[PDB]
Curated annotation (Swiss-Prot), chains A, B:
Known function: Major determinant of the species specificity of RSV infection. The trimer of F1-F2 (F protein) also facilitates the attachment to host cell by binding to host heparan sulfate. F protein is involved in the entry into the host cell through the interaction with host IGF1R. This interaction activates PRKCZ/PKCzeta that recruits host NCL/nucleolin to the apical cell surface where it can bind fusion glycoprotein F1.
Protein encoded by which gene: F
Phenotype upon changing residue 43 to S: Impairs translation or folding of the F protein
Glycosylation sites (chain numbering): 1, 44
Stated name of the protein: Fusion glycoprotein F2
Quaternary state and interactors: Homotrimer. Heterodimer with fusion protein F1; disulfide-linked. As a heterodimer with F1, interacts with host heparan sulfate. As a heterodimer with F1, interacts with host IGF1R; this interaction activates PRKCZ/PKCzeta that recruits NCL/nucleolin from the host nucleus to the plasma membrane. Part of a complex composed of F1, F2 and G glycoproteins. As a heterodimer with F1, interacts with host RHOA; this interaction facilitates virus-induced syncytium formation.
C-alpha cells in the first residue's frame, strides 16, 4: 500500500510502499531472419499476378 | 376415350377416339444474332485472363 508523509518544516513529501525493479545489467540475444539469395527475376510475363 | 374393335373376319383392328393435329402448311420466321466485327486482337499481354 502506498502511503505519504508531508514535512511542513522543509516543504517536501515522501511517498512510500513501492517495490523495486532496477535494471542492473544486460542480456544479449541474437535474432535471425533466414533470407533467400535472389539475383535476376526471370520472366517476360506481363501477367498481373 | 380410346376404344378398339377387332374384326375376326379380316384379321384387323381399329383404334378410335383420337383427335387430329395435322401439319398442313408452314410458318417461316427469321431468327437473328447480332455479331461484332472483330479483326485483329491487339495485345502483347501474356496475362492468363
Amino acid at each position: 500500500n502506498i502511503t505519504e508523509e508531508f514535512y511542513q518544516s522543509t516543504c517536501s513529501a515522501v511517498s512510500k510502499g513501492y517495490l523495486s525493479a532496477l535494471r542492473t545489467g544486460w542480456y544479449t540475444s541474437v535474432i535471425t531472419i533466414e533470407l533467400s539469395n535472389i539475383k535476376e527475376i526471370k520472366c517476360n510475363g506481363t501477367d498481373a499476378k
